[PDB]
Amino acid sequence: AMVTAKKDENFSEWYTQAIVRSEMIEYYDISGCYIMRPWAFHIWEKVQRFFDDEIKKMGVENSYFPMFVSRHKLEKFSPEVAWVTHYGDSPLPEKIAIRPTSETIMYPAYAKWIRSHRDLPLKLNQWCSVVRWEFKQPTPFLRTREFLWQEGHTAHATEEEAWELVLDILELYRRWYEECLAVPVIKGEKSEGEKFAGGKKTTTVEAFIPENGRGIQAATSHLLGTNFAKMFEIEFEDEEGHKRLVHQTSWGCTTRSLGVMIMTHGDDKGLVIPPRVASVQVVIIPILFKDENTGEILGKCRELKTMLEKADIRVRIDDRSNYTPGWKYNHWEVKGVPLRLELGPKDLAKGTARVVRRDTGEAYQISWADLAPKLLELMEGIQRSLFEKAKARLHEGIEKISTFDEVMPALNRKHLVLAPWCEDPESEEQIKKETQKLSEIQAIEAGGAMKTLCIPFDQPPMPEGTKCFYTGKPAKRWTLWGRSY
Amino acid sequence: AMVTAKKDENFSEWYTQAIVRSEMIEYYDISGCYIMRPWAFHIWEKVQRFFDDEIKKMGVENSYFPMFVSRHKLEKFSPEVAWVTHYGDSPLPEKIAIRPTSETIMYPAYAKWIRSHRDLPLKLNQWCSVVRWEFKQPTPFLRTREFLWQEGHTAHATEEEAWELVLDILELYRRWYEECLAVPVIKGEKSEGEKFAGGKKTTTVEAFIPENGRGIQAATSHLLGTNFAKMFEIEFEDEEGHKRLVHQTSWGCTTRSLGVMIMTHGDDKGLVIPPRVASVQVVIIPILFKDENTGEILGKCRELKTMLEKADIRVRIDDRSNYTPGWKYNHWEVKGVPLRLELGPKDLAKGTARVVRRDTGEAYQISWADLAPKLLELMEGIQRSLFEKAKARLHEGIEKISTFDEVMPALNRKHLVLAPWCEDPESEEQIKKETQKLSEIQAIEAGGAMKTLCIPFDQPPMPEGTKCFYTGKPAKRWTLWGRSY
Ligand SMILES: Cc1cc(N2CC[C@@](C#N)(C3(C)CC3)C2=O)cc(C(=O)NCc2cc(F)cc(-c3cnn(C)c3)c2)n1
Ligand SMILES: Cc1cc(N2CC[C@@](C#N)(C3(C)CC3)C2=O)cc(C(=O)NCc2cc(F)cc(-c3cnn(C)c3)c2)n1
Ligand SMILES: O=C(C[C@H]1NCCC[C@@H]1O)Cn1cnc2ccccc2c1=O
Ligand SMILES: O=C(C[C@H]1NCCC[C@@H]1O)Cn1cnc2ccccc2c1=O
Ligand SMILES: [Cl-]
Ligand SMILES: [Cl-]
Ligand SMILES: [Cl-]
Ligand SMILES: [Cl-]
């Protein structure tokens, strides 16, 4: 089974083929829900371990809160909430909702647990699934009605400490995407219209999908401030004895990250998995001629596997006799294994192995003694090259503009725009409406809204007197806009 | 905050105090659901890592299937199923159920995935929560409306291979309880009346709670046979080309395990956590006289912590100046930390530390150079002693009987009974009914049913011609009975 849709032509069909034929997902009779098979789930387990280890260093501890929230507590978005109303065919006295997020589940407990400044900071995380029942068309990994995530929630005695935590977690999400998944992301702050309404400031990491020109939010970290503390009466006492509101954060990231990884590195042959998260980094394929000492070849493959595992390289031998090497090459290319090692009688006679890298197809002849250090070096080169090429595509996908006239041409090249902006929220909604209308007109001519993605932390120079690209009022900051998921 | 209820007098109040005052659980406004705070959740993470590592050696892979099942697929117990019927206030075309278990979610996929004998065995596991909405009174950890678990599901070409896997998983559950949690359990097969009706044979590990005399199922491993394969049309082709049904297993274990651990080792002071799963194995408490070189004492505590962590000992220093040592001693005793290390000026002058073990209160004076190996030895002694004392209580809690006349006296001593049994299912239900009725009579005289717990793998000798303790017919095997959760 090969991927036959080309990534640059029918991107949606390519994506479906890549994730189905690699055995990452399976469909399900309830629309908008997908089965995560082991090939994808192993990658989730790897980024989960990374993130857990990092937040444990910060003093965050895992926990588990109930999946249900009482009507009263939830209603302290609404068409997205799935409601449990009966046990069997008996009606519940009050209906209960499945968590779309757990603020209203956790914060009553926080109010009970926090009494003194000595109780702070309080730092909790949980890994679980949440449910958001939208009637729109789903996309595997990217927009689904049930998804796995982690959500962290912290409380602090001061706004500055909470803010520092918000930025520390955002840096962890940058590392999740860029270090683990080799996906470049842009740190920024959401516009007033796009931020979490329950909070003070929402920070984000944003990724870019060149094939459809869309930005996609990769993860989020909110400075909640004291808003939820007032609503849930979460207060603490200073050492003088006065009661003060806590300052809160919340943050999350989902299996969307896997989809972004898939879209970023995949090619016409299928998946390409970054070595740092590949469950199989090296697949060993013995050549099995009928007229050969097959036992010797297999024994050497086993020895090489042991030698590589001593360097913590994750190895699988595909010694199935009933498939050709060509079949196996394709099979593990579709699944995205970053390195394949081939060993036949001539290699054994020379004391070498043939190694082929998945991203470029370049082949190497490596001595057995050099194999472990050379493969470690090659995997680091593959990881870095995947990231650097994606980063070049990201920066080639952003157009710096000064006037609204440049917007629609840039959108039609499937690019984002970086533009000086007045940051008035009313203007963002005017811009969404107008770019949607222009996109519809174009659609009819062909036989869509542009919104803010983020106000980037990394601000280009802003010349004095620069005007907003849409209102002509004084610009405040450079803002990243585009079509979006 | 101290535990004030005595374990041997008001066991239910003791249990509640132990798990609340140690900060393991928090209550919730939806009855039958509880919050798992980090002190308990860390123990879950530890047994999860153990079990994951062990099943990965068996070729089992983790996955994630949806939490929802369509009405049609579920109804292929019923008053326990929670039904989602509305998104917002809009009605679903067909209601969907929250998983009480995932056979009906997973096996349609299995039928799609399995085509050839080369596809077998198929071995999958998932970690998730499930929901069983009983209107009866809940018990934290032991019987709750939502609980965390793992469920494994495998498919094999032959019954013998599946059966071998059933027993391998049951041995893993024995290790989960006995090796990790120091809880002794009895392997056995469930009676025909008590087994999973969807399967062929159900094996179990059973634990015993002496304070209320109750047996409790600890984990389960089912030989499903071909029953579900017929129902879901899961078939494979041999190399000759004929289609055959797969032979399946399923198995699971829940956070009930934590409650069993708590009940087994706890004492009047609170929790006692086995060192192998304790998140803090050693708490270091500096003595902080006002008239002392506090910096030197704290610096030595830090050095000792580093030295112990190099032996992979999990250490916390409680250097809070605003609590007395006596307060701290109680605080970490309630939470069950197995070792406390005390260090003050006299200890520093002697080059030793004072170490107190939680299970017995015995104190030791240990040189700094001996600290790591001696504490490793002490933790192994604590783990083994917790297990051996629990095992002695288990065997003292079982009475071997020959006649039904011995049942009610043994139940009144809060014991289980091991009795020769004819294994006729009708007789088990007669025994349940009669022992319930006798228990009610006794209750009224004081101002309850006994069922089979398991047919143990370890069978005592059965003399020729032994009769069933209840029917007088020829006995088949020794069966373990008792009151139960
Ligand atoms: C996996 C996932 C991930 C995310 N998000 C949101 C932000 C975030 C990031 N960063 C989080 C949660 C981490 C902070 C993330 O990952 C959102 C959704 C989702 O909104 N699901 C419902 C749904 C189902 C569905 F069938 C269709 C749609 C749908 C179709 N068109 N439109 C416009 C919607 C939506 N799902
Ligand atoms: C945590 C957990 C664990 C378990 N089990 C079952 C077997 C098993 C083992 N081994 C598994 C699942 C691993 C195979 C286990 O752990 C069962 C329940 C439960 O049945 N919950 C519903 C409920 C809620 C409730 F408020 C009250 C009751 C209730 C009150 N009186 N009676 C008679 C029932 C029941 N809960
Ligand atoms: O979930 C959040 C805020 C943060 N919660 C913690 C983890 C990170 C996350 O962005 C925003 N949101 C999103 N979607 C909904 C749908 C229905 C009901 C509530 C919500 C709702 O509140
Ligand atoms: O869940 C099982 C069988 C096994 N499933 C896999 C993990 C181990 C587990 O014992 C039995 N059961 C128990 N309780 C229910 C309540 C409502 C609906 C179905 C059920 C139901 O089927
Ligand atoms: Cl939001
Ligand atoms: Cl969100
Ligand atoms: Cl059952
Ligand atoms: Cl069950």
Contact B83 A80 (CB under 8 A): no
**Dihedral sign (CA B400, B403, B406, B410):** positive
The CATH code of the domain at B275-394 is 3.40.50.800
Distance CA B70, CA B52 (A): 29
Please report, in range form, the residues annotated as the binding site of B for Ca(2+).
164, 168
Contact A41 B29 (CB under 8 A): no
Tell me, rounded to whole angstroms, the distance of Cα B161 from its chain centroid.
26
Distance CA B216, CA B138 (A): 15
Minimum CA–CA partner of A61 in chain B: B38
Record the tokens describing residue B448, joined without a space: 């309850």
For the CA of A202, the nearest atom of ligand 3: 10
Please report, in range form, the residues annotated as the binding site of B.
164, 168
Distance CA A407, CA A482 (A): 9
CB atoms within 10 A of CB B455: 20
> Is A151's C-beta closer than 6 angstroms to any atom of ligand 3?
yes
Residue to substitute in A128, A144, A220, A484 for testing ligand 1 pocket (most ligand atoms within 8 angstroms of CB): A144
Candidates A28, A114, A124, partner chain B, best to mutate (most B CBs within 10 A): A28
| Cβ atoms of residues B357 and B338 within 8 Å | yes
Q: Helices A294-309 and A371-396, interaxial angle, to 10°?
A: 70
Distance CA B393, CA B391 (A): 5
Beta strands in B99-200 (DSSP E): 122-131, 146-156, 186-189
- For atom 18 of ligand 1, the residue with the nearest CA is A143
Record the tokens describing residue B117, joined without a space: 């004998």
- For atom 32 of ligand 1, the residue with the nearest CA is A136
Question: Among all chains, which residue has been given the structure tokens 């359990």?
Answer: B185
Tally of residues, chain B: 485
Q: CA angle, B283 as apex, B43 and B267 as ends, to 5°?
A: 60
| Cβ atoms of residues A251 and A131 within 8 Å | no
| Cβ atoms of residues A374 and A354 within 8 Å | no
Minimum CA–CA partner of A320 in chain B: B118
Instruction: Give the containing element (helix H, strand E) for B426.
Output: helix B425-446
Distance CA B325, CA B360 (A): 19
Instruction: Tell how strand A186-189 and strand A477-482 pair up.
Output: unpaired
Q: Looking at the partner chain, which of A42, A79, A90 has a beta carbon nearest the beta carbon of B87?
A: A79
Q: The domain A398-482 is classified under which CATH number: 3.30.110.30, 3.40.50.300, 3.40.640.10, 3.30.200.20?
A: 3.30.110.30
CB atoms within 10 A of CB A362: 11
Ligand 1, CB within 6 Å, residue ranges: A 32, 132, 134, 136-138, 142-145, 147, 149, 217-220, 252-254, 256
Distance in Å, CA B300 to ligand 1 centroid: 51
Record the tokens describing residue B196, joined without a space: 């999973």
Using alpha carbons, list the distances in angstroms from residue A372 to A274, A375, B242.
18, 5, 45
Distance CA A161, CA A386 (A): 36
Q: Looking at the partner chain, which of B33, B66, B322 has a beta carbon nearest the beta carbon of A30?
A: B66
Record the tokens describing residue B371, joined without a space: 């600290």
Candidates B86, B126, B280, B322, partner chain A, best to mutate (most A CBs within 10 A): B86
Contact B84 A87 (CB under 8 A): no
> Is B144's C-beta closer than 6 angstroms to any atom of ligand 2?
yes
| Cβ atoms of residues A190 and A204 within 8 Å | yes
A1: Cβ–Cβ under 8 A, 6 or more apart, which residues? A21, A331, A334
| Cβ atoms of residues B177 and B386 within 8 Å | no
| Cβ atoms of residues B71 and A30 within 8 Å | no
Distance CA B188, CA B202 (A): 9
Q: Looking at the partner chain, which of A41, A73, A82 has a beta carbon nearest the beta carbon of B62?
A: A41
Q: Which of A438, A2, A18, A386 is nearest to A183 (CA)?
A: A386
Q: Looking at the partner chain, which of B36, B86, B131 has a beta carbon nearest the beta carbon of A63?
A: B36
Q: What type of residue is A200?
A: K
Contact A35 B84 (CB under 8 A): no
Distance CA B213, CA B415 (A): 5
Q: Looking at the partner chain, which of B26, B61, B80 has a beta carbon nearest the beta carbon of A109?
A: B26
Contact B113 A73 (CB under 8 A): no
Domain boundaries, chain B: 11-263, 275-394, 398-482
Ligand 4, CB within 6 Å, residue ranges: B 77, 80-81, 100-101, 103, 132, 151, 196, 220, 250-252
Assess if CATH 3.10.20.30 describes domain B11-263.
Answer: no
CB atoms within 10 A of CB B89: 10
3-state secondary structure A131-186: ECCCCCCCECCCECCEEEEEEEEEEECCHHHHHHHHHHHHHHHHHHHHHHCCCCCE
CB atoms within 10 A of CB B38: 19
| Cβ atoms of residues B154 and B248 within 8 Å | yes
Q: What are phi and psi of A342, to 5 degrees?
A: -110, 135
Minimum CA–CA partner of A34 in chain B: B66
Q: Which of B131, B393, B141, B128 is nearest to B258 (CA)?
A: B141
Contact A81 B73 (CB under 8 A): no
> Is B256's C-beta closer than 6 angstroms to any atom of ligand 2?
yes
- Burial class of residue A367 in the structure, from the number of CB atoms within 10 Å of its CB (0-12 exposed, 13-18 middle, 19+ buried): exposed
In the three-class reduction of DSSP (H, G, I as helix; E, B as strand; rest coil), residue A215 is classed as strand
| Cβ atoms of residues A331 and A297 within 8 Å | no
Residue to substitute in A143, A147, A263 for testing ligand 1 pocket (most ligand atoms within 8 angstroms of CB): A143
Q: Helices B256-265 and B38-57, interaxial angle, to 10°?
A: 110
The minimum CA-CA distance between B410 and chain A, rounded to whole Å, is 38
Residue to substitute in B101, B134, B146, B201 for testing ligand 4 pocket (most ligand atoms within 8 angstroms of CB): B101
Using alpha carbons, list the distances in angstroms from residue A273 to A11, A36, B314.
18, 16, 35
Count how many pairs of residues, chain A against chain B, have C-beta atoms within 8 Å: 139
The minimum CA-CA distance between A63 and chain B, rounded to whole Å, is 5
Resolution (A): 1.6
Beta strands in B99-233 (DSSP E): 122-131, 146-156, 186-189, 201-209, 214-225
Contact A84 B80 (CB under 8 A): no
Distance in Å, CA B143 to ligand 2 centroid: 4
Beta bridge partners of B484: B215
Distance CA B124, CA A233 (A): 45
Nearest ligand to the CA of A197 is: 5
For the CA of A101, the nearest atom of ligand 1: 12
Contact A61 B42 (CB under 8 A): yes
Distance in Å, CA A195 to ligand 5 centroid: 6
Nearest ligand to the CA of A254 is: 1
Contact B87 A133 (CB under 8 A): yes
| Cβ atoms of residues A129 and A98 within 8 Å | no
Q: Helices A38-57 and A256-265, interaxial angle, to 10°?
A: 110
A319, A321, A324, A327 alpha-carbon torsion, rounded to 10°: -60
Distance CA A48, CA A426 (A): 39
- For atom 22 of ligand 3, the residue with the nearest CA is A101
Q: Give me the half-sphere count of Cα atoms (radius 13 Å) on the Cβ side of residue B12.
A: 4
Beta strands in B255-362 (DSSP E): 282-286, 315-317, 339-343, 352-357
Question: Among all chains, which residue has been given the structure tokens 């036989």?
Answer: A447
Using an 8 Å CB-CB cutoff, list chain B residues near A28: 66
Beta bridge partners of B419: B479
CB atoms within 10 A of CB A440: 12
- Burial class of residue A173 in the structure, from the number of CB atoms within 10 Å of its CB (0-12 exposed, 13-18 middle, 19+ buried): buried
> Is A150's C-beta closer than 6 angstroms to any atom of ligand 3?
no
| Cβ atoms of residues A42 and B126 within 8 Å | no
Contact A35 B96 (CB under 8 A): no
Preceding peptide of B121 cis, ω within 30° = yes
Using alpha carbons, list the distances in angstroms from residue B36 to A64, A109, B436.
5, 11, 34
B420: Cβ–Cβ under 8 A, 6 or more apart, which residues? B402, B462, B466, B467, B468, B469, B475, B476, B477, B478, B479
Contact A29 B96 (CB under 8 A): no
Q: Which of B157, B165, B230 is nearest to B203 (CA)?
A: B165
| Cβ atoms of residues B212 and B412 within 8 Å | no
